[PDB]
Structure 1
Amino acid sequence: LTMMWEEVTCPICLDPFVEPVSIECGHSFCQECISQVGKGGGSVCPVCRQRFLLKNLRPNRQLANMVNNLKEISQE
C-alpha cells in the first residue's frame, strides 16, 4: 500500500492531495500548490514542463476520494 500512497501524493508538497486539480497535460496537483506556481509569469508544469493556464483547471474527485479511502486504512 506504499505504492498506492505513491499515486495520491502531490509532486509539489509531497503530501497527499488537497483539492486535486489537473492541468492541460493531465498532471494533477493540490489546488493551492499549482495556484502558487500560477502566479509566476510563464506558468509551466513542474512534471513535464508543458505550458499551462489556471483558467483550464479540472477537479480530479476520484483522487480526493482515494485519499480518504487510504486514510481510513492507515488508522489500522
Structure 2
Amino acid sequence: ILLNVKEEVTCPICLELLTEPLSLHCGHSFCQACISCPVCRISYQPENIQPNRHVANIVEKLR
C-alpha cells in the first residue's frame, strides 16, 4: 500500500517525488519546475494552476 501511495505522489515527468506540486483541475499534479495535461490531455487555462500544499506535506511524511 506504501508503494501505491508513493506512486500517487510521483511526478510523471521527472519520475521523482513531487517538489512544489502544482495541480490541474483534472487532479493530476507536477513539480513546479516540470511545467493540455501531459497525462490526461484535458485542457486547462494557464492560470487554473494551483499549488497543492497538502500533497507537499504527504510527500514529506513519506520519506
1:24 to partner: Cα distance: 3.2
1:14 to partner: Cα distance: 0.8
Return 5+ residue gaps in structure 1 as ranges.
Answer: 35-43, 72-76
1:14 maps to amino acid: L
1:52 to partner: Cα distance: 2.1
Question: For 1:16-67, what per-residue CA distance to the aligned partner results, in whole angstroms no more than 9, with x for missing partners?
Answer: 0011111232211111112xxxxxxxxx111111112332211111110011
Identity of aligned residues (%): 56
* 1:69 matches 2:61: yes
Cα distance between partner residues in 1 of 2:46 and 2:20:
14
How many residues are treated as equivalent by the alignment?
62
Larger Cα-atom Rg: 1
TM-score calculated relative to the size of structure 1: 0.71
Structure with higher helix content: 1
TM-score calculated relative to the size of structure 2: 0.83
Question: Counterparts in 2 of 1:1-76, with a 5 A limit?
Answer: 1-34=2-35, 44-71=36-63
Cα distance between partner residues in 2 of 1:3 and 1:26:
16
- Show structure 1 runs of 4+ deviating over 4 A: none
Question: RMSD of the alignment, in Å?
Answer: 1.3
